[PDB]
Write a protein that holds these residues in place. Structure first.
Motif, PDB file in Angstrom:
ATOM      1  N   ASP A  85       3.417  -9.228  50.201  1.00 28.08           N
ATOM      2  CA  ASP A  85       2.063  -9.736  50.578  1.00 28.08           C
ATOM      3  C   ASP A  85       2.256 -11.032  51.333  1.00 28.08           C
ATOM      4  O   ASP A  85       2.111 -12.135  50.735  1.00 28.08           O
ATOM      5  CB  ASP A  85       1.221 -10.004  49.293  1.00 28.08           C
TER       6      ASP A  85
ATOM      7  N   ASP B  73       0.643 -12.717  53.843  1.00 26.65           N
ATOM      8  CA  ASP B  73      -0.438 -13.699  54.050  1.00 26.65           C
ATOM      9  C   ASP B  73      -1.147 -14.061  52.726  1.00 26.65           C
ATOM     10  O   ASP B  73      -2.215 -14.691  52.718  1.00 26.65           O
ATOM     11  CB  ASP B  73      -1.416 -13.232  55.156  1.00 26.65           C
TER      12      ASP B  73
ATOM     13  N   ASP C 173      -3.031 -12.507  50.894  1.00 25.63           N
ATOM     14  CA  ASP C 173      -4.446 -12.109  50.802  1.00 25.63           C
ATOM     15  C   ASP C 173      -4.775 -11.171  49.606  1.00 25.63           C
ATOM     16  O   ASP C 173      -5.939 -10.747  49.434  1.00 25.63           O
ATOM     17  CB  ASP C 173      -5.031 -11.650  52.181  1.00 25.63           C
TER      18      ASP C 173
ATOM     19  N   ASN D 286      -3.700  -8.342  49.317  1.00 27.29           N
ATOM     20  CA  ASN D 286      -3.572  -6.973  49.877  1.00 27.29           C
ATOM     21  C   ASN D 286      -2.174  -6.899  50.508  1.00 27.29           C
ATOM     22  O   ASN D 286      -1.900  -7.446  51.587  1.00 27.29           O
ATOM     23  CB  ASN D 286      -4.616  -6.585  50.929  1.00 27.29           C
ATOM     24  N   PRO D 287      -1.248  -6.260  49.783  1.00 28.14           N
ATOM     25  CA  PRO D 287       0.093  -6.217  50.279  1.00 28.14           C
ATOM     26  C   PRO D 287       0.224  -5.403  51.600  1.00 28.14           C
ATOM     27  O   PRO D 287      -0.561  -4.422  51.809  1.00 28.14           O
ATOM     28  CB  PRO D 287       0.835  -5.487  49.118  1.00 28.14           C
ATOM     29  N   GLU D 288       1.223  -5.735  52.426  1.00 27.98           N
ATOM     30  CA  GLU D 288       1.588  -4.955  53.638  1.00 27.98           C
ATOM     31  C   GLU D 288       2.461  -3.731  53.231  1.00 27.98           C
ATOM     32  O   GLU D 288       2.462  -2.738  53.953  1.00 27.98           O
ATOM     33  CB  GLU D 288       2.420  -5.793  54.639  1.00 27.98           C
TER      34      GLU D 288
ATOM     35  N   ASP E  58      -2.577  -3.367  53.769  1.00 31.59           N
ATOM     36  CA  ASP E  58      -2.711  -4.292  54.891  1.00 31.59           C
ATOM     37  C   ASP E  58      -1.835  -3.854  56.043  1.00 31.59           C
ATOM     38  O   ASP E  58      -0.634  -4.263  56.242  1.00 31.59           O
ATOM     39  CB  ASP E  58      -2.355  -5.690  54.370  1.00 31.59           C
TER      40      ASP E  58
HETATM   41 CA   LIG Z   1      -1.560  -9.098  52.705  1.00 32.41          CA
END
Ligand SMILES: [Ca+2]
Ligand SMILES: [Ca+2]
Length: 270
Positions: free
Chosen positions: A19, A21, A23, A25-27, A93
């Motif tokens: 994650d 950024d 946020d 919401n992991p990439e 993300d």
């Molecule tokens: Ca993220």
């Protein structure tokens, strides 16, 4: 900063989000996922360098005993994008809105840069997998009217489940060169419908790009499942299945240095 997960020290099921950024919401999400190992000695460790973007897996497992020999492979240490339906883990993300219905998705390229070093003859593949489910946000497993699709771009000594259907040719890119590559299409009933595309010329390291819909369109076309377009493409998982019931020692190292999903202006299912 290096993200590290380790079996057995972190427990039966080590895993973590990636994650960047922060946020929430992991990439991507990583799991050691030794899902058919009942007991073993040794360890497996995966690290993700938050600055170089390099994921590195080192596995030195011995005295392996499996949960269920009929499930054949030992595990599938992996990184994935989307909703993995066997647990509460997810990573959304990214540019492709998984989970979404197959009938609603755009096509996309999946590009992976990697290098595999299985040791001592260990049976392995490098396989991309997606689950297709009647519920988008499933977290408790898979039913008999759902599908698993695998695309094997490397293998040594491992064979997919089920039976061979046919061969297809798919334009892919290998280390920068467009190649019309032949894949064997295999189909099984293993509790759900399974379709695997095993390349005929396996690629042990480099950068490989596939058009995802070439494979999902064939899996749709050969499916025995009813109301196939109701299904959600849950995720894209990338990892190495390894071992068979003949294998009691599994030493393996690999690296994945980039994963990119690139949307295309055409439907997923052609
Ligand atoms: Ca993220
Ligand atoms: Ca999940």
């Amino acid at each position: 900063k290096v993200l590290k997960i380790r079996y057995p020290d972190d427990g039966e099921w080590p895993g973590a989000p990636i994650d960047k950024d922060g946020d929430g919401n992991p990439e991507f999400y990583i799991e050691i996922n030794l899902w058919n190992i009942l007991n073993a000695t040794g360890f497996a460790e995966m690290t993700y360098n938050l600055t170089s973007g390099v994921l590195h897996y080192v596995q030195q497992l011995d005295n392996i005993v499996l949960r269920d020999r009929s499930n054949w492979v030992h595990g599938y240490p992996e990184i994935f994008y989307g909703n993995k339906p066997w647990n509460a883990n997810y990573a959304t993300d990214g540019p492709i809105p998984l989970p979404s219905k197959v009938s609603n998705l755009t096509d996309f390229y999946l590009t992976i840069s990697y290098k595999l070093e299985p040791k001592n003859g260990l049976p392995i593949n490098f396989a991309i997998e997606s689950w297709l489910t009647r519920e988008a946000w499933r977290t408790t497993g898979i039913n008999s009217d759902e599908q698993e699709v695998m695309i094997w771009i490397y293998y040594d000594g491992l064979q997919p489940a089920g039976s061979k259907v046919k061969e297809i040719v798919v334009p892919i890119i290998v280390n920068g060169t467009p190649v019309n590559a032949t894949f064997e299409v295999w189909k099984a009933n293993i509790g759900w419908e399974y379709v695997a595309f095993r390349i005929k010329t396996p690629i042990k390291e480099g950068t490989v790009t596939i058009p995802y819909g070439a494979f999902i369109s064939v899996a749709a076309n050969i499916s025995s499942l009813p109301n196939y377009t109701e299904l959600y493409l849950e995720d894209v998982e990338i990892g190495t299945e390894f071992g068979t019931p003949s294998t009691t020692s599994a030493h393996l190292e690999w690296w994945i240095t980039n994963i990119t999903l690139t949307p295309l202006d055409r439907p997923l299912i052609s």
